[PDB]
Amino acid sequence: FACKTANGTAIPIGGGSANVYVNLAPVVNVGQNLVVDLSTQIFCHNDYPETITDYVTLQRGSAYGGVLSNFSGTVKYSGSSYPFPTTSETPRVVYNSRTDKPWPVALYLTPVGGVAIKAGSLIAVLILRQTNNYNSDDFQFVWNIYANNDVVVPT
């Protein structure tokens, strides 16, 4: 089991850390959601699906910077939503193919004015936890999520 990003970096077998850079809607109003879709950013696969089933959770999602100070909301993981920043580990998603499969995570963030997220800033850290039905591997793939652009909340 290993993963790759839309910015051309990787995390190999056994886990590790990578940076992800997301383009964000430049304007989000109060009462609206800013969507941060990681399924277009993070892709993973199973290295031996003939015999091994991989299980993948969002272990913890943490907020930083302007997201931490100016937003609340949810994380949607494989079709169900939970508070973000997270308060539990999600259910598992199965990875059962060598073919790249998106990691089905998206943040829905709503403003609690002006530049609310600064370009280049860290907005979130998402920990992907991978186990399997084969051995006792239990690995963390740590994704540091950065904004590529400013996000403005109008008055």
Ligand X SMILES: CNS(=O)(=O)c1ccc(-c2ccc(O[C@H]3O[C@H](CO)[C@@H](O)[C@H](O)[C@@H]3O)cc2)cc1
Q: How far is the CB of 100 from ligand X (least distance, A)?
A: 13
Minimum distance, C-beta of residue 89 to ligand X, in the bound complex (Å): 18
Closest by Cα among 69, 4, 71 to 31: 71
Which residues would be at the binding site for ligand X (CB under 6 A)?
1, 13, 46-48, 52, 54, 132, 134, 137
What is the rounded CA–CA span in Å between residue 62 and residue 113?
22
Neighbouring C-alpha atoms within 13 Å toward the C-beta of 140: 11
Give the residue nearest to ligand X (CB). 132
Q: How far is the CB of 75 from ligand X (least distance, A)?
A: 24
Cβ 128 to ligand X shortest distance, Å: 12
Helix, strand, coil: what percent of the chain each, to 5? 5, 55, 40
Number of continuous H segments (helices) and E segments (strands) in the chain: 1, 15
137 vs 150, which CB is nearer to ligand X? 137
Q: Least distance (Å) from ligand X to the CB of residue 125? A: 22
Tokens 């008055």 identify what position? 155
Q: Which is nearer to ligand X, 65 or 104 (CB)?
A: 104
Name the residue nearer to ligand X (CB basis): 16 or 91: 16
Nearer to ligand X, 54 or 117 (CB): 54
Helix (H, G, I), strand (E, B) or coil at 7: coil
Q: What are the CA-CA distances from residue 75 to residues 50, 82, 99, 103, 154 (Å)?
A: 32, 5, 25, 13, 24
Q: Which is nearer to ligand X, 29 or 133 (CB)?
A: 133
